[PDB]
Design an enzyme around this catalytic site. Sequence first.
Site, PDB file in Angstrom:
ATOM      1  CE1 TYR A   1     -12.242 -15.279  -5.617  1.00 51.47           C
ATOM      2  CE2 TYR A   1     -12.250 -16.209  -3.261  1.00 51.47           C
ATOM      3  CZ  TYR A   1     -12.598 -16.113  -4.409  1.00 51.47           C
ATOM      4  OH  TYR A   1     -12.778 -17.571  -5.103  1.00 51.47           O
TER       5      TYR A   1
ATOM      6  CG  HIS B   1     -15.296 -36.005   0.544  1.00 57.10           C
ATOM      7  ND1 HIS B   1     -16.685 -35.938  -0.172  1.00 57.10           N
ATOM      8  CD2 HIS B   1     -15.126 -35.982  -0.323  1.00 57.10           C
ATOM      9  CE1 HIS B   1     -17.165 -36.130  -1.329  1.00 57.10           C
ATOM     10  NE2 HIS B   1     -15.764 -36.251  -1.700  1.00 57.10           N
TER      11      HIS B   1
ATOM     12  CB  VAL C   1      -6.732 -23.208  -7.152  1.00 58.93           C
ATOM     13  CG1 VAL C   1      -7.498 -23.555  -5.603  1.00 58.93           C
ATOM     14  CG2 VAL C   1      -5.903 -24.162  -7.038  1.00 58.93           C
ATOM     15  NE  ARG C   2     -12.123 -19.909  -3.674  1.00 54.46           N
ATOM     16  CZ  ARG C   2     -11.889 -20.346  -3.227  1.00 54.46           C
ATOM     17  NH1 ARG C   2     -12.455 -20.827  -2.077  1.00 54.46           N
ATOM     18  NH2 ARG C   2     -13.707 -19.974  -3.261  1.00 54.46           N
TER      19      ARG C   2
ATOM     20  N   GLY D   1     -12.740 -22.776  -9.769  1.00 49.85           N
ATOM     21  CA  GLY D   1     -13.610 -23.541  -8.532  1.00 49.85           C
ATOM     22  C   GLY D   1     -14.980 -22.681  -8.423  1.00 49.85           C
ATOM     23  CG  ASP D   2     -15.310 -18.751  -7.068  1.00 47.12           C
ATOM     24  OD1 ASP D   2     -14.051 -17.703  -7.406  1.00 47.12           O
ATOM     25  OD2 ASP D   2     -15.357 -19.544  -5.728  1.00 47.12           O
TER      26      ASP D   2
ATOM     27  N   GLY E   1     -19.328 -23.760  -7.432  1.00 48.72           N
ATOM     28  CA  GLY E   1     -19.521 -22.684  -6.479  1.00 48.72           C
ATOM     29  C   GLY E   1     -21.123 -22.958  -7.038  1.00 48.72           C
TER      30      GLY E   1
HETATM   31  C1  HEM Z   1     -12.543 -24.939  -1.622  1.00 48.70           C
HETATM   32  C2  HEM Z   1     -13.445 -25.534  -1.976  1.00 48.70           C
HETATM   33  C3  HEM Z   1     -13.145 -26.183  -3.848  1.00 48.70           C
HETATM   34  C4  HEM Z   1     -11.850 -25.980  -4.408  1.00 48.70           C
HETATM   35  C5  HEM Z   1     -10.726 -24.733  -4.369  1.00 48.70           C
HETATM   36  C6  HEM Z   1     -12.589 -26.386  -5.567  1.00 48.70           C
HETATM   37  C7  HEM Z   1     -11.644 -26.098  -7.063  1.00 48.70           C
HETATM   38  C8  HEM Z   1     -12.409 -26.649  -8.234  1.00 48.70           C
HETATM   39  C9  HEM Z   1     -12.175 -26.397  -9.490  1.00 48.70           C
HETATM   40  C10 HEM Z   1     -10.321 -25.569  -9.721  1.00 48.70           C
HETATM   41  C11 HEM Z   1     -12.131 -27.183 -10.448  1.00 48.70           C
HETATM   42  C12 HEM Z   1     -12.111 -27.581 -11.627  1.00 48.70           C
HETATM   43  C13 HEM Z   1     -11.400 -29.015 -12.436  1.00 48.70           C
HETATM   44  C14 HEM Z   1     -10.719 -28.896 -13.575  1.00 48.70           C
HETATM   45  O1  HEM Z   1     -11.564 -29.036 -14.342  1.00 48.70           O
HETATM   46  O2  HEM Z   1      -9.237 -28.612 -13.816  1.00 48.70           O
HETATM   47  C15 HEM Z   1     -13.544 -27.665 -10.338  1.00 48.70           C
HETATM   48  C16 HEM Z   1     -14.199 -28.387  -9.634  1.00 48.70           C
HETATM   49  C17 HEM Z   1     -15.534 -29.070  -9.217  1.00 48.70           C
HETATM   50  N1  HEM Z   1     -16.406 -29.179  -8.147  1.00 48.70           N
HETATM   51 FE1  HEM Z   1     -14.944 -27.709  -6.826  1.00 48.70          FE
HETATM   52  N2  HEM Z   1     -13.514 -26.790  -5.622  1.00 48.70           N
HETATM   53  C18 HEM Z   1     -13.790 -26.309  -4.583  1.00 48.70           C
HETATM   54  C19 HEM Z   1     -15.219 -27.249  -3.163  1.00 48.70           C
HETATM   55  C20 HEM Z   1     -15.841 -27.756  -4.836  1.00 48.70           C
HETATM   56  C21 HEM Z   1     -17.689 -28.607  -3.751  1.00 48.70           C
HETATM   57  C22 HEM Z   1     -17.741 -28.144  -2.048  1.00 48.70           C
HETATM   58  C23 HEM Z   1     -18.471 -28.995  -4.542  1.00 48.70           C
HETATM   59  C24 HEM Z   1     -19.440 -30.032  -3.898  1.00 48.70           C
HETATM   60  C25 HEM Z   1     -19.957 -30.208  -5.089  1.00 48.70           C
HETATM   61  C26 HEM Z   1     -17.223 -28.985  -6.096  1.00 48.70           C
HETATM   62  C27 HEM Z   1     -17.779 -29.704  -6.802  1.00 48.70           C
HETATM   63  C28 HEM Z   1     -16.997 -29.419  -8.138  1.00 48.70           C
HETATM   64  C29 HEM Z   1     -17.465 -29.928  -9.184  1.00 48.70           C
HETATM   65  C30 HEM Z   1     -19.100 -31.110  -9.571  1.00 48.70           C
HETATM   66  C31 HEM Z   1     -16.725 -29.707 -10.397  1.00 48.70           C
HETATM   67  C32 HEM Z   1     -16.253 -30.192 -11.957  1.00 48.70           C
HETATM   68  C33 HEM Z   1     -17.189 -28.945 -13.358  1.00 48.70           C
HETATM   69  C34 HEM Z   1     -18.413 -28.774 -12.743  1.00 48.70           C
HETATM   70  O3  HEM Z   1     -19.113 -29.885 -12.442  1.00 48.70           O
HETATM   71  O4  HEM Z   1     -18.562 -27.891 -12.875  1.00 48.70           O
HETATM   72  N3  HEM Z   1     -16.441 -28.345  -5.710  1.00 48.70           N
HETATM   73  N4  HEM Z   1     -13.133 -27.590  -8.233  1.00 48.70           N
END
Ligand code: HEM
EC number: 1.14.14.18
Length: 210
Positions: free
Chosen positions: A49, A21, A127-128, A131-132, A136
Site C-alpha cells: 500500500y 481460494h 484491484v486493491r 476489493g477492499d 474486504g
Molecule cells: C487479494 C485478494 C482479493 C482481491 C485483489 C480482490 C479484488 C476484488 C475486486 C477488484 C472486486 C470488484 C469486482 C468488480 O465489481 O469489478 C471484488 C469483489 C468481490 N470480492 Fe474480492 N478480492 C480479493 C479477495 C476476496 C476474498 C478473500 C473474498 C472472500 C469473500 C472476496 C469476495 C468478493 C466478493 C463477494 C465481491 C463482489 C462484491 C461484494 O460482494 O462486495 N474477495 N474483489
Amino acid sequence: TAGLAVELKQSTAQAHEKAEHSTFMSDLLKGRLGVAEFTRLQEQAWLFYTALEQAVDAVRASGFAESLLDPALNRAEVLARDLDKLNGSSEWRSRITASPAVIDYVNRLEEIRDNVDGPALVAHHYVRYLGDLSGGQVIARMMQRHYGVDPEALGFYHFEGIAKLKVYKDEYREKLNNLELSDEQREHLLKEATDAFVFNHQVFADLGKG
Ligand code: HEM
Ligand SMILES: OC[C@H]1O[C@@](CO)(O[C@H]2O[C@H](CO)[C@@H](O)[C@H](O)[C@H]2O)[C@@H](O)[C@@H]1O
C-alpha cells in the site's frame, strides 16, 4: 462493448477466484489460522500500500484519472495504526521485511510511479481498493468473528470519510467507464489488472509457506 468496468471484472474473474481460494486466505477466513497470521498479512499489505499510494500520488499529480484517485481511499496511515494495535507497539516498522512476492509487487508499483504510468496505476487501484470495498468487508467481519480482533484494529476496512459504499462503488465504476483511453492504453490497463491479481495471489502463497 459494455464499458471498461465490465471488461475489467470479466477479464480478472478467474484471477479473482484463484486469489480468493488460495490456501492461506481460505484457511484465514474459515477460522483455521489466527490474529498472528492476519497481522503478517497486514504487515505485507502495509509495504505494498505504501508503494501503491506513492504511485497514486504521482499519477494524480500528472492530471490522469483525478476524480477516480480519491485521497479518502488512502490506507497506509490507518494501516500503520492497525499494526500498532495488533503488535502492541511500533516495533514492527523495523522488524518487517518484504516477502519475495511483495518485492516484485513493490518493484512494479515503483516502476509505475516513476514512469507515471496512468493506465497501469488505474489497474492496480481498481484491484486493491475495489476489493477492499468488497471482499474486504467480509474479511473484517471474519477477523472479528473467528479471532476476536478489535474493530479498532480493522480501520483499514472501515474507509472513514465514506458513507454509502455501494453508491461509492457504482460511482467508481462510472468513473472507470468515463476515462479516456486509447486502444493501446486500455489493453495495457487490462493486462496490468491481471498482473495485479497475480501479485496478490503470490503474496498469499508466500504467507502460506512461512
Ligand atoms: C487479494 C485478494 C482479493 C482481491 C485483489 C480482490 C479484488 C476484488 C475486486 C477488484 C472486486 C470488484 C469486482 C468488480 O465489481 O469489478 C471484488 C469483489 C468481490 N470480492 Fe474480492 N478480492 C480479493 C479477495 C476476496 C476474498 C478473500 C473474498 C472472500 C469473500 C472476496 C469476495 C468478493 C466478493 C463477494 C465481491 C463482489 C462484491 C461484494 O460482494 O462486495 N474477495 N474483489
Ligand atoms: O463476485 C466476485 C468475483 O468472483 C467471480 C470469480 O472471480 O465470480 C464468481 O463469484 C460470483 C459471486 O460473487 C458468482 O456469481 C459467479 O458466477 C462466479 O464465477 C467474478 O466473476 C466476480 O467479479
